[PDB]
Design a protein around this ligand. Structure first.
Ligand SMILES: *C/C=C(C)/C=C/C=C(C)/C=C/C1=C(C)CCCC1(C)C
Ligand SMILES: CCCCCCCC/C=C/CCCCCCCC(=O)O
Ligand SMILES: CCCCCCCC/C=C\CCCCCCCC(=O)O
Ligand SMILES: CCCCCCCC/C=C\CCCCCCCC(=O)O
Ligand SMILES: CCCCCCCC/C=C\CCCCCCCC(=O)O
Ligand SMILES: CCCCCCCC/C=C\CCCCCCCC(=O)O
Ligand SMILES: CCCCCCCC/C=C\CCCCCCCC(=O)O
Ligand SMILES: CCCCCCCC/C=C\CCCCCCCC(=O)O
Ligand SMILES: [Cl-]
Ligand SMILES: [Cl-]
Length: 264
């Protein structure tokens, strides 16, 4: 049902996709160790924001690892090209993983925005419902990326509606709560918003690849877009969230944060 299954791949195409996914694994688990060690310099009220980046690194790292092994399981070099064997490859499992990872990315944002108690719970709930609506409709849509492009497009339109509404909740909370933020991170959080807008928009672009580039090179392009998007939306984003958490920790008088920023 996925366009990947339609084509044979050159040695170059196959190996590049393998390297992309493997590099993805390496970057996420390397970042994991960074977030782990810096977590001790985060104040208790923000420390979960850094913990969530650790959780996202392993979740994303495992899905990329699984995709890479699925890639090599599914294809073998036969008569001059990599050809599909008995096992299958599908990006569908990425969608399932987003059900967990996207709420984690959203929650760590709400935490460094200094949302608390009732507002935190209600905002998270609405955000997660919007995100789940987006993911589920998108998942359904990509089931048709070979059989029914028109259906892919309509489910994609519905998903994009959830996407836009989710982004509106995010933007509204960011620009409303920007003023509460310490240590100059009122400035930084604005860049986080734009980073999110950029990186997350790469995913629906990948979703549409079967509509504008239905061939083996399109398959490569989609994996390339996922790689850019994953690293931007999880790793670079996580680094910014953690930087914001530490800076606010220091401004709030958390001594390990002050000491850590002092050594650099
Ligand atoms: C770490 C993974 C992330 C941040 C994934 C984000 C995914 C999206 C923003 C997906 C968006 C989609 C649309 C807006 C329309 C097409 C269907 C989706 C689900 C790919
Ligand atoms: C935040 C940015 C992260 C960047 C991740 C991407 C790193 C590797 C990028 C690809 C370079 C282009 C390689 C040329 C593709 C050859 C085409 C082919 O052989 O199939
Ligand atoms: C930076 C280098 C990017 C690697 C290019 C791999 C593409 C290829 O060799 O087919
Ligand atoms: C492989 C990597 C192992 C990393 C272990 C690092 C332990 C961190 C200690 C700590 O800060 O609590
Ligand atoms: C095939 C039916 C698809 C139903 C989509 C359900 C939308 C989910 C909404 C928020 C949870
Ligand atoms: C909740 C929203 C659920 C779906 C809204 C209906 C529009 C997209 C469904 C397309 C159905 C089809 O193409 O057969
Ligand atoms: C061509 C790769 C770069 C595309 C980035 C633009 C999409 C995000 C816009 C906001
Ligand atoms: C080419 C450019 C690639 C961008 C690479 C991004 C690298 C990591 C982001 C680290 C986040 C640090 C927040 C900014 C610190 C500050 O505001 O002074
Ligand atoms: Cl605290
Ligand atoms: Cl993920």
């Amino acid at each position: 049902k996925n366009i990947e299954s339609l084509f044979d791949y050159s040695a170059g195409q196959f190996e590049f996709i393998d390297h992309l996914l493997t590099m993805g694994v390496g970057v996420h688990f390397a970042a994991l160790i960074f977030f782990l060690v810096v977590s001790q310099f985060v104040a208790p009220k923000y420390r979960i924001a850094t913990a969530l980046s650790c959780i996202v690194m392993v979740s994303a790292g495992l899905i990329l690892n699984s995709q890479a092994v699925m890639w090599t399981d599914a294809y073998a070099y036969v008569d001059g090209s990599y050809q599909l064997q008995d096992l299958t490859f599908s990006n569908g499992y990425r969608y399932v993983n987003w059900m967990a990872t996207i709420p984690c990315l959203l929650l760590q944002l709400l935490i460094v925005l200094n949302l608390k108690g009732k507002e935190l719970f209600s905002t998270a709930t609405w955000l997660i419902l919007a995100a789940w609506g987006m993911i589920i409709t998108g998942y359904v849509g990509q089931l048709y990326e070979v059989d029914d492009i028109a259906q892919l497009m309509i489910w994609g339109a519905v998903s994009t509606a959830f996407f836009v509404v989710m982004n509106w909740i995010v933007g509204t909370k960011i620009f409303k709560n920007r003023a509460t933020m310490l240590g100059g991170t009122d400035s930084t959080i604005t860049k986080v918003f734009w980073l999110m807008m950029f990186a997350w928009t790469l995913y629906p672009i990948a979703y549409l690849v079967p509509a504008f580039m239905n061939n083996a090179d399109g398959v490569v392009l989609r994996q390339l877009l996922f790689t850019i998007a994953d690293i931007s939306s999880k790793v670079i984003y996580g680094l910014m969230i953690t930087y914001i958490a530490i800076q606010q920790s220091a401004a709030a008088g958390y001594v390990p944060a002050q000491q850590a920023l002092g050594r650099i």
